[PDB]
Amino acid sequence: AIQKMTRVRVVDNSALGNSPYHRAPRCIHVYKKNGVGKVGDQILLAIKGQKKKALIVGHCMPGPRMTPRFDSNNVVLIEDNGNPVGTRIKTPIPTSLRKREGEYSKVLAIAQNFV
């Protein structure tokens, strides 16, 4: 569960995510009617003094049984149009995204590992 003002780990090849900064990227907003964000939920970050859209790919909070649980809250940066900012995802990505409603094909394509 990712809410407003949740510190977040960017799992991406993108320069914006990986570049050193004094503060960790923080969730500005969750694009869901309830504030709570899960896997496949688009969020808005404060990263490097700019507002940027991101997609959640795993989190610490437990979910359904067979679904994986990650030790860190993991996001992938996306532009307003919907394409990913970064080229590659090294961190393993759950396969539950495929069936979920939304634009997940781009992210799965650039992903290398699935858990």
């Binding site: 090849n13 149009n81 080229t87 590659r88 394509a109 650039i110």
Partner: protein, 102 residues
Amino acid sequence: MRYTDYFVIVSGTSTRHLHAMAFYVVKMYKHLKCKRDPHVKIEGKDTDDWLCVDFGSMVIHLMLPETREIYELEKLWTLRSYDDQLAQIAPETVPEDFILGI
């Protein structure tokens, strides 16, 4: 690799050309598909450079040549962990004794 049977990447001349190709294949799919077969969604319509359609056994990527070059999806799927862009990525390291320096 638990994604698809076939991964297809194609190039288009223009955004309009990408749209034309993506819509035609989906229209042809709907005609030929079984009733039990689920409907497909064209993804990245608003994007001017990248379109992708996911079927049951196939994934189609429709992208502009300059977009294709930087992403090099061909290299990634042929070489899963041996990709050039993966090599430049270095895993994060926690400092020893859990004390930062400088």
